[PDB]
Every structure is written in structure tokens, then in C-alpha cells.
Scaffold this active site. Structure first.
Site, PDB file in Angstrom:
ATOM      1  N   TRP A 112      19.201 -21.936 -19.677  1.00 17.54           N
ATOM      2  CA  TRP A 112      18.705 -20.968 -18.712  1.00 17.54           C
ATOM      3  C   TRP A 112      19.884 -20.358 -17.927  1.00 17.54           C
ATOM      4  O   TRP A 112      20.733 -21.077 -17.423  1.00 17.54           O
ATOM      5  CB  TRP A 112      17.722 -21.603 -17.731  1.00 17.54           C
ATOM      6  CG  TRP A 112      16.901 -20.602 -17.038  1.00 17.54           C
ATOM      7  CD1 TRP A 112      16.903 -20.301 -15.707  1.00 17.54           C
ATOM      8  CD2 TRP A 112      15.922 -19.760 -17.638  1.00 17.54           C
ATOM      9  NE1 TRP A 112      15.987 -19.306 -15.446  1.00 17.54           N
ATOM     10  CE2 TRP A 112      15.355 -18.977 -16.616  1.00 17.54           C
ATOM     11  CE3 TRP A 112      15.447 -19.596 -18.946  1.00 17.54           C
ATOM     12  CZ2 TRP A 112      14.356 -18.040 -16.863  1.00 17.54           C
ATOM     13  CZ3 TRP A 112      14.438 -18.685 -19.180  1.00 17.54           C
ATOM     14  CH2 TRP A 112      13.906 -17.917 -18.137  1.00 17.54           C
TER      15      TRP A 112
ATOM     16  N   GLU B 200       6.385 -22.863 -16.958  1.00 13.05           N
ATOM     17  CA  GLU B 200       5.108 -22.195 -16.822  1.00 13.05           C
ATOM     18  C   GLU B 200       4.922 -21.075 -17.863  1.00 13.05           C
ATOM     19  O   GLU B 200       3.787 -20.699 -18.182  1.00 13.05           O
ATOM     20  CB  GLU B 200       4.901 -21.638 -15.371  1.00 13.05           C
ATOM     21  CG  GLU B 200       5.530 -20.273 -15.121  1.00 13.05           C
ATOM     22  CD  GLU B 200       7.041 -20.306 -15.028  1.00 13.05           C
ATOM     23  OE1 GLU B 200       7.613 -21.412 -14.860  1.00 13.05           O
ATOM     24  OE2 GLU B 200       7.663 -19.212 -15.067  1.00 13.05           O
TER      25      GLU B 200
ATOM     26  N   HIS C  11      12.957 -26.946  -9.258  1.00 17.04           N
ATOM     27  CA  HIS C  11      12.409 -26.587  -7.960  1.00 17.04           C
ATOM     28  C   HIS C  11      12.441 -27.768  -6.994  1.00 17.04           C
ATOM     29  O   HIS C  11      13.507 -28.114  -6.489  1.00 17.04           O
ATOM     30  CB  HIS C  11      11.014 -25.928  -8.064  1.00 17.04           C
ATOM     31  CG  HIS C  11      11.008 -24.670  -8.868  1.00 17.04           C
ATOM     32  ND1 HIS C  11      10.196 -24.506  -9.958  1.00 17.04           N
ATOM     33  CD2 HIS C  11      11.681 -23.493  -8.717  1.00 17.04           C
ATOM     34  CE1 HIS C  11      10.395 -23.303 -10.480  1.00 17.04           C
ATOM     35  NE2 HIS C  11      11.305 -22.677  -9.752  1.00 17.04           N
TER      36      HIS C  11
ATOM     37  N   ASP D 291       8.236 -19.339  -7.660  1.00 16.07           N
ATOM     38  CA  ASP D 291       8.575 -18.310  -8.633  1.00 16.07           C
ATOM     39  C   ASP D 291       7.479 -18.030  -9.639  1.00 16.07           C
ATOM     40  O   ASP D 291       7.704 -17.351 -10.625  1.00 16.07           O
ATOM     41  CB  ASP D 291       9.861 -18.694  -9.337  1.00 16.07           C
ATOM     42  CG  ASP D 291       9.677 -19.838 -10.339  1.00 16.07           C
ATOM     43  OD1 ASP D 291       8.597 -20.495 -10.319  1.00 16.07           O
ATOM     44  OD2 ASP D 291      10.572 -20.137 -11.179  1.00 16.07           O
TER      45      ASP D 291
ATOM     46  N   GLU E 108      10.510 -18.836  -1.291  1.00 17.10           N
ATOM     47  CA  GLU E 108      11.557 -19.563  -2.016  1.00 17.10           C
ATOM     48  C   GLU E 108      12.972 -19.067  -1.672  1.00 17.10           C
ATOM     49  O   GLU E 108      13.899 -19.866  -1.497  1.00 17.10           O
ATOM     50  CB  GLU E 108      11.323 -19.476  -3.525  1.00 17.10           C
ATOM     51  CG  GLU E 108      12.399 -20.165  -4.350  1.00 17.10           C
ATOM     52  CD  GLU E 108      12.166 -20.092  -5.843  1.00 17.10           C
ATOM     53  OE1 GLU E 108      11.024 -19.774  -6.292  1.00 17.10           O
ATOM     54  OE2 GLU E 108      13.148 -20.341  -6.572  1.00 17.10           O
TER      55      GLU E 108
END
Ligand code: NA
Ligand code: NA
Lengths: 247, 248, 249, 249, 247, 249
Positions: free
Chosen positions: B36, B120, B141, B150, B240
Site C-alpha cells: 500500500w 473494506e 487504523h 476512511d 481522521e
């Protein structure tokens, strides 16, 4: 209109009431219901009658024979033009909106397989299934038809997001114990025990105070009503467009 | 309007191969499991836009490569220190998930292994397939001191249910394949070898359906996720960002 | 100015409030035994949740009971359920009970030490729900008693159990044991009685050690849908419950 | 089978139903004079709106009264307002009244022939609203009379007048004259008494000429938000209205 | 896609930027816009390009000549079948959702009559109109077409429930001073004053801090975005069904 | 458990509180002159609205200012606006300010005695809005000062003025005079300087004469949609306002 009138209006729906418990039994000439335009439109009108009749204290919905409803007469439907689809859209809305307008608790007793409007029983407040009950949505996406008639509202609502979408797209058949595990069914019973169990539950509910009974239903169907109003007619119009396009 | 021949080659972290209307989207870093990065994040937003606008995609398979779907991150690829910098993350994060939801064909996930970065995304699919080795976990997170704002906050409670979703996000729970299956986030658990063949088999079946049936099935099935995403995503992202900036 | 912890920690005869390293332990009780539900306890919880919400030194909340039950006994004589007058006090404080609970802006952990039949929805509204092997959940005070489940039970149970499990639970008086609650997803972990509170403290310390705004905003982003459905449906529920109940007299 | 027009057109002592070229003229009255609001009229309108909705040969509806008033007298003695189970008859039929109205799937034109003080929200729920110069709108029977405006008034008036004009109208007993209603946007056209029904007919004929599905789906796409808020808020208002009214004895 | 790529991409949309204020001028060969399926789809794609380009500080949307857009090339659209209508539905969704995805303030300067997608200008955060501007929905219901393309969402939202439904059923033309009184328009200017005023307001907005400009737009479009997601696709499917029924 | 009027009526340096026959007159002020907006005043109003809402002896509320202006001066040095830390306090108390106001369950009358530029949304959230001829409404402290109007301004103004008037008002720094506010439907009556408080008292006394439950439920049924949009959009607005403001440094 009083029970004595409407109890005999419907060729596909037997209606018997004992102690304010209404047993509604769908059928074709006394065999398992064969789905038709007629049975569809009768259930919508019948749901309205049941809802308007205060002497219905609790409703039990069931079928007869080995199936709840897993046969269809496609020759009975006109699916080709916008004209004919608006008849389906209009009564499809009334079918499910009249069901939700019933203001007493509704118990389903699913006696066997259902593949046509299988969402109707699982919209009930209590869902009881025979060992042989199954649920499956073959007439929609497996048959190349959008599941836009309420199926798209109810199955993600009752199974959850991913189980519901997968059920609708793959033609998965849920047996009684898988439906129980997924939370769509509350009890699995032998065929012989199914209706006695429905009556026992219904009688218990019927013994409760008039307003308690009526308002239990009202307070429990708020979210289902909201999502039906939001998404039902959008589903139906899209299903209609997709179906007309085949011609 | 961008043609397949161009967009299929424009993404360094996304291989895009189409056969008989079935689009296979494989995320990767130099042909190994995706790391990522800011670049992958933004590429997926743009790529989902391109996929959605291309009507010759009949059905989509989303998968990874190697032992992981995506369980490594390069944190130095993100600017996380100022509002200015967070606005670009907020803007592209909204686009990431809204562009995914704007895809109007059925989407199939094939989760080939562990996913900790935007896990997700696969579970937003209409059909979710998992390898035996697949796992889902939101470690980047809350376990790392970061608000799960997010989209994780929308999707996990939506797909797992209220209490499982909140717990999953607060504790760093790792869901293995068969727990995800029982929780209803995954539909099928397969061996690694069986995973893609099964994804293809389901995709080919869907692709055979009539044009508007395929399209409108996806549309009528995603109403509630789209409502909750519109209601809650931006709120999650702004919070966030506020919290993350406070860290420095 | 806000009510400081030194004041509100000692305000409630049925709620003990102990804060250790910013972790607030809320223990409901009746003289150091399992809570007996009363009008007083009802209203105390509503005011207490507000005090907790307004106190930003609470980093995380653990809600628990004491003894063998979380709350499965009631003093029926402590309520007045006969007039619209009677009921407006219940409607008003009942709205405040759950809305103040939801206004708490840090994560809430429930540790359900035993059976709960009175406002069992409260623990399962928590972000993390832990249960002892002996915990149960049941809604007998509503429909099995001839009372509408409209005090928030109608919102929370279909939300956490799902549509059909929730409606069935509320209509039939189903008792969920700990492992059933776990499987249904209302409970996250089942522990021995001796390991329950220790685990609650373990998870609570882990949350309390996250950065300030991170923990405060996690709760806020995670409770959006529950807040939406509570605002839509709670008052409707309470007014209908009140009408039905007055009708009995 | 649906109830045929030949039958239902004669079934209501307070509602005249006359149809020509598919335009249905719905005239509310008491013995051919201006309507006096009663329990009978209230329920008749609920049933009638259902019959109209189910008869697809109604292409467009004109709703109007007769004589100097649309409806500005009420017979309170015709209602039973003292117990919860009597209020449930009103709650049930009150929900049907407005939901059945909204379930009509062709355009509805109101022709407000004079003052309306009882259920004045009905005519302003129409897609087109015409008023005679002498038309007025006022909600005196709710708040100015010590009754909660919770019967749909609370939904419709804030929806059509806007937030602040709606709340004020409902709390102060304000009477809106025709030109004020026009300026507030609840009325679309103000006509002399002689031109009112001729204009309604002109507009209805125009609509009735349009294609079947266009005419039907126009109504449907235009009432989405009104339907949302009625579902969200109607029952809540009615139960609260009932509670407050019962406490009054 | 940076501005120098997309600024020249659209035959019916001139794009000019000054101090980061983007002036979007719709036209047909430099005359008043003639609505076509091309203009329709170009607006949809253009709004996406504008939304994704962070150097746009503020947007002004205007027309040219005597009309904003009150002519049409009815031959350019294919309105015969469902799969042709899916083109219009898909892109009609993009037209309005891409508009709402623009995350800077949008100012409309309505230079004259608009009858084709007149809802677009009034979706703007500030609406300025020349004395000659008018708004009318002739192409939908007065033409036997369902106003389900977003007209149904926006006009009741901006005019209120009753003025909106009436405007959409009767073919009412709102002149500039009526639109002003109804709240759809904020300022009515002489034709010569309209664009200078648009520039003045846009520049004033452009002077504010980056994130303040962007977030002002984001917090102000919440309700419109909510109703558009709820109702748009419902309207477009029904409009499509009714239109196909016409042949 | 609710603080009685005797205690809270004297607790707020910027809020004079007096009650007569259940009418509560809330007068905001700085040392007996027109209120100057400060962090203190903001936080006081939030606390005070909670005390008002919980005190059932308040039958109706009049909110007003003193001197020539309702509130048109601010002391920017009283606010901490630099860090996420600073802003989370503003977010938290900004939510409590508007949510506590909406938690009040009796009708609220605003008597706007002159210009308001700081939190002008507060008076127009009232159920009845009265304005002196000299009243003006303007949102200069937000967008005209380079700050997002995300504190509830973004909810309330489009809600009360309509979509386009609300957005224009917030982006351009438009000043609404009393007659324009009346025409736009934010204000219900424009009165002379001498008639403002007499009129508010007259309306408040009339409302206070109504039956207990009807009074209380009238507010509750009338504020449904405002509550729903406030829940949907308030916190999103505040967080984005905070992010933009912090960036200014
Ligand atoms: Na399960
Ligand atoms: Na006006």
C-alpha cells in the site's frame, strides 16, 4: 369490509379465523400455490383487507402441500411492454406496501420450498420453517431478470449485505437450517409440528392487550418500511426496463 | 471518455486484463503482493472511475497476487502532517470508495491472502471469495493510533453488523477466512488453487446474463451502502485527519 | 462550568464510579448487590451518562454490574404507569437515558456479569460487549408482560441481532444465553466470571493508551447509524408504549 | 378485483364523486352545504382516497368544497377523544387518511372555494393549488384549542411554508388569506369565485390529455420527499396528540 | 487530466480561467446553446474534469447570446428502447452527480431563457440572472414527458413543495423577477451587468483560503446530494418507461 | 437531580434569567450592555440551554438581547483556534450548543432586538421569530472572514431561507434586514422597538396558558426535520471548519 365478505373473495387464498388469529393459506385448487398474476394481485388486495380489519389480532401466513410456492405459470403474466409492466409495478408496490400496512404481528409458517416471492414470508415478525423449507431466488437473476421487486430490499435487510447480494446473484438455495443460521428463520420444526407451533405462538400474542399487540408491530417495522419506501419502486422500474429490453 | 486500450496500461500497481467482458483487476507491486502506497491509493480511485465509465466491462474480478492481497504499507509515501495534505487524502479517499460504488456491474472479490490495507474494499464486492489463507484486519487504523474514518467505519459495521464491526475496528481483531465466512463478510472459502478458477466461473456465468439485467442488479443491490457512505464517509475522513494532524 | 468527577462520582446511589488512569468503571448496584431496577435507577443512569459525557477526563468507559446478575430484578412499586402525566416523565427521561448514553464520546465497553432483563439493550449498545458464561439477555418486562417494547428495545435489538432475530426476540421472550448472544453477534467475547472484568480492564487500558483525538473520534464515527435510527424511532416507540400502557387502566 | 367507480361513487354521504373524460371531481359537503368536519367525514375521506387510488380510470383529481367555505365548522361531539383505544381508531384512520391521499398516483388539483380550518393540510398536499379570493387557511382546532398539531399538520405546514412560517402558523393560530398563502407558496393561483372551478377544469383537462404513464409517473416522482417525512413523523405526532388530549380528562 | 488537456476537449463548452476562477460558457458555434445528446454528455464529462482539477478555485457557469439554452436538436437523442434509455440514465446520473462532486463554489450567470436542463443553473450556490432570463420545463410534462431527470428533485427543493410541483406540471415560465421572489435566483442584473457581477462575486470567493473555499461548498451541498441520491435514478427509470411507451 | 431555577438563574455572567408564570426570559448581555461574543458566552449558552431543557417549570422560553444589538461584536482573543486540540474543544461545545437548544422541549420565541452577526442561527432556530425593525442577520464571522460556515450555519440557513437563498447568504456576507428576513420566512413578525418585548410576552403568556402536555408535545412534533439534518450534518461541518482554520496557520 367485514371478514364474512372478504374471507371468500380469493380463489388462491383460504382465510380462516379463530379467536382473532387469522390463518392465511395460499393454494392452487387446494394443492401448493402456483404463482400467477391472479395470485399476485389477490395477495395484494387480501393484505389490504386484512390490514383494514381490526378483528384480525395476529396473522399466520402459510402454504399447503409439499411446497409453500415453487411453481409458476409464466403464461399468466404480460411482461413485454411498459403498459403491462406498469400494472406489475403498481400491484407489486401494493403487494408489499399492503403487507407492511398490516398493524398486527405476522407469523410465517413456511411448509416447504419457496422460489416465488420468497421475501414475503421473511418479512414476517416471526419466521417458522418446516425441515423441508427452502428459499431461493431463481426467477430473478439466474433467469436473467433483475431482482427488483422487493427482493433487493428484503434479502440484504434480513441476511445482511454480502449474504444478501450473493443469494440474489448466484441462485443460492437456503435450506431451513442455513436460513436459521443466517437469521432469516427463527425456528425449524418437523412438518407435523409447524402449524401447531404457529398457532401456539399466535394464540399467546392474541392474549396480549389490544393496543400492546398493535403497537408491537408498528414499533418493529420502522426500518423495513423506510428502506421499502426508498428502494422498492426504483427496483421495479429498473426490473421493468431490463425485462422489456429482452424483446 | 478513456478507452480500455489506454487505461488498461496506465496503472503501475494494477494489472487489467479482460476476456469476454470479464475484467480481472490484479493489484500488485512489481508483480509481487501489493505494498500500500499513496500511489496505489490514488491509482485505484482513478482506475475505478475508468472501469465504471467503460460499458464493455460486463463484470469485474478484484484480486491480488502472491501470498498477500495487501498486508504491507510504505508509510513514507503519505503526507499526513497538515490539513492541506490531508485534504488530498480526503478528496481521493472519497473518490476511491465512491468510484467503486459507481461501477454498474457486479463485482467479485477473490482474496488471495492477508489484507490489512483498505480491507473494506474487497468486502464491498457483491460476491466475496476467499482463499484459506485470507485474513482481514484493520491494524493501520485504531491499533496504530489512527481513527478508522476512511470508510472502514461505514463498511465493517454494515457487513459484520453493529457489534462485530465496532469490535473489529477497535481491537485489531484478525478475521481468518472461516470466521469471515461465518460472519457473512465472505461467501466462499476455497483453496488457493481453486480461488481464481471459481472467480472466473462465477464471472462467466454473470457475464452471460442480458445487458440491463447485469447492470441493474448491481444498481438495485447497492442502494443502502451508497446511502450510508454518502451520510458518513466525509465525516469520518475529516475527523481522521484532525486526529492524525494532532499526532504531530 | 461542568460537574467535576469528584462531585458526580458520588451522586448516584445505584451507580458506583471509579476512575483509574482515565479508565472509568461504572458499576450498577443496589447496596453492593445486583441492581434492582427502579424509577430512581432509571433516572440516575440518564443523568449519570450526561455527567460522563461532559467529562473529557473519562478516556474510556466500562459498564458493569455486580453479583450474579447484571440486572434481572425490579421494584414494580417504584414506577407510576397509569396517566399521561406519569408517562411524560418516563418518555422524557427514557429519551434522555439512551440519547445521553449515545452522547458519550469515548468508547464504551460492557462487561455483562450475569442475567439482564431490565434495559438489556443498554449493554449491547456498547462498542465492545463482553459477557460472563452466565450472562443472559431477555425482554420479559415488555411484550411477554403485555407492554410495548418501545423504550429503545425496538431500535436496538433489530439493529444488533438483525431484523428477524430482533423482532422474534422482542415478541416471544426468548432468552439469549451467552454463547447464543455471541453467535448472534450481540456479544464479542464470552469469559469465565473471574476473567470478565480483567479482560474489560485489559481492553479498556489498550484504548486509553491511544492518542486523545483518535479515541474520542473512533466512537463518533462508529455510532452514526445507531444515532440515526434512535432519533427516528425512539420517541415514536415511547409514546406508543405509553398509550398502550395507560389503556390497561 | 377493485371496487368499480359505479359503486364507490355513491358510497360516501360527505363526498360527491363525479367523473368526466377521466377527470374526477371530488366535492366534500354536508347535505349539499359546506362540509362540517366529523368522525364520519374523516374516515370517509380515508376510504375514498383508497378507492380513488385503486381505480386507474381516474386520470386526474380535482378536490373542492361547496358554498362559502371549504370546511370551517367541526362537530367535536362526533369524535371520541378521551381514552387510548378510542384514540387508536383516530390514529389508525388518521394515518390512512394521509397515506391513502399520497398513494393516489395521478396529479391532484385543489380548488379551495373558501375558508378551511379543519384538516387544511389536505388541499395543500395537492400538486396544484388554486384558491378563491375568499379562501383562508387556519389551524385553530389544534394548538389555539389546546390540542397538539400532530395529525399531519406538523408535517405538511413546515414542508410547504418552510420551517419558520410553518411552526408559527401552527402555534399562533395565524389565518392565511388567499394572497398570503399565494405569497408563501402554498397556493399557486388565486381566482375569483366564478373562475375557480372553470380554471381547475381547464388544468385538469390539459393533464388528462397527456400520455398514460407520463401522467401517472409525474405524480410519483414529485411526492418522494413528502412521503418520506410523512412516514418518518406522522405516527409520532398522532401518538403524542392522543396522549396530550387524553390527559385533558 | 490538467486544464490544458480538457479546456479544448468540448465543442459546446468554452473554458477560460483567470485568477483560478473558471468561466464555463456553453454555446453552439458561438451562438446560444442548442441542446443535444453531445452537449448533454460533454457537460457530464466536463463537470468531472472540473471537479478533479484542484486549480479551479471557483466556477462560473453561463451561456452566450440571447438565450442560456432554449433550443434543441430533438433528432440527436435516441429515446426508443431501454438500452438506448440506459445511455441517457447512466449519463444523466453522471451529469448531475458530477456537478455536485465539484468541491468549489459554483455561480450561475443566466444570460437569458433556459428550457433545457434549467435545473443546472439553479443547483449553483449563487444564482445571478439577466433581466431577460427565464426558466421553464416545457420539454418534460407539457411535452408528455415525465420530469424525472433531476427536474423532480431540484425544482421542489429550490422553489418549495407547491411552487415546484406546479412549475413542473403546468409549463409555467418564471421570469427573472418571479424566480428572484421564489428564491431560485439571488440577483437580477441588466444584461451588461451580469457577467461583471459574476466575476466580482467569484473573485471575492477566490480570495478566501484554499480549504475554506472548498469546504464551504462541501458543507452546503449536503441536503441536495442526499435527495439526489435518494430520488434521481428512480425518476430517470420512470421517465424512460413512460417515454418508451410513447411508441 | 435536575438543577432548580434558583441555582442556575444566577450562574451565567452573560445570561440574565427570569421567570414569571412559567415564562422564562433569557436575556443575553455583556455587563448589562449588548452581548459581545466570547468563548465564555458560547460555553455559558450551551450549559444554560441544558439547564433550561431539564427544568420542567419552564413553560415557554423568550430569547432576547439588550441595548441596540442582539449580538454584533466578538472578542476573537477569547478563542483558541490554532490546533486540533483547541478545535476539538470548539467542536465538542459547538455540538452541545445547538443540540442542547434543540433538546429544549417547550416552544422558544426569539425577540431579536437589533443586529446579530455572531451565531445568528440561534434566534432563527426558534419556533416563533420576532424582530425589531432594526434587527439584521449576517454571517460575517464565517466565510467573509475566511472561516467555513460549518458550525450549524450550514444547516440552519438553507433550512430556513431555502436552498439558494441560504447558500448565497452564507457565501456573500449578505446582511438581511428585518423586512427581508420577514419576506424570506426566517422572521414571522417585524415590530417597532417599543412593541417587540410586549408582543413576545403576549405570545409567551398565551402559549403558557395551554395545557401542559399539548405545550410540551407541540415543540417536539415541530422540530423533527431540523433535528434530523442537524444530526446528519453538524459534526461534518465542524470538523471541516476546524481543518480549514488550522490550515490558516
Ligand atoms: Na451468524
Ligand atoms: Na417568498
Amino acid at each position: 369490509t367485514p371478514f364474512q365478505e372478504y374471507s371468500q373473495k380469493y380463489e388462491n387464498i383460504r382465510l380462516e379465523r379463530d379467536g382473532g388469529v387469522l390463518l392465511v393459506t395460499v393454494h392452487t385448487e387446494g394443492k401448493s400455490l402456483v404463482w400467477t398474476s391472479t395470485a399476485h394481485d389477490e395477495l395484494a388486495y387480501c393484505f389490504h383487507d386484512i390490514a383494514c380489519d381490526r378483528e384480525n389480532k395476529v396473522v399466520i401466513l402459510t402454504g399447503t402441500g409439499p411446497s409453500f410456492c415453487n411453481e409458476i405459470d409464466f403464461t399468466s403474466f404480460n411482461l413485454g411492454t411498459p403498459h403491462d409492466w406498469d400494472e406489475i409495478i403498481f400491484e407489486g408496490q401494493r403487494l408489499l406496501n399492503n403487507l407492511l400496512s398490516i398493524e398486527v404481528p405476522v407469523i410465517a409458517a413456511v411448509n416447504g420450498p419457496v422460489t416465488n416471492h420468497p421475501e414475503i414470508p421473511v418479512m414476517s415478525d416471526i419466521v417458522l420453517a418446516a425441515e423441508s423449507a427452502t428459499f431461493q431466488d431463481g426467477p430473478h437473476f439466474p433467469s436473467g431478470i433483475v431482482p427488483g421487486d422487493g427482493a433487493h430490499v428484503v434479502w440484504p435487510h434480513v441476511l445482511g449485505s454480502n449474504r444478501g447480494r450473493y443469494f440474489l446473484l448466484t441462485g443460492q438455495e437456503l435450506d431451513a437450517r442455513t436460513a436459521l443460521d443466517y437469521g432469516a428463520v427463527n425456528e425449524v420444526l418437523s412438518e407435523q409440528e409447524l402449524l401447531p407451533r404457529a398457532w401456539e405462538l399466535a394464540r399467546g400474542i392474541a392474549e396480549k392487550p389490544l393496543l400492546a399487540r398493535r403497537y408491537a408491530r408498528k414499533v418493529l417495522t420502522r426500518q423495513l418500511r423506510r428502506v421499502m419506501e426508498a428502494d422498492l419502486s426504483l427496483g421495479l422500474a429498473h426490473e421493468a426496463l431490463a425485462a422489456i429490453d429482452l424483446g
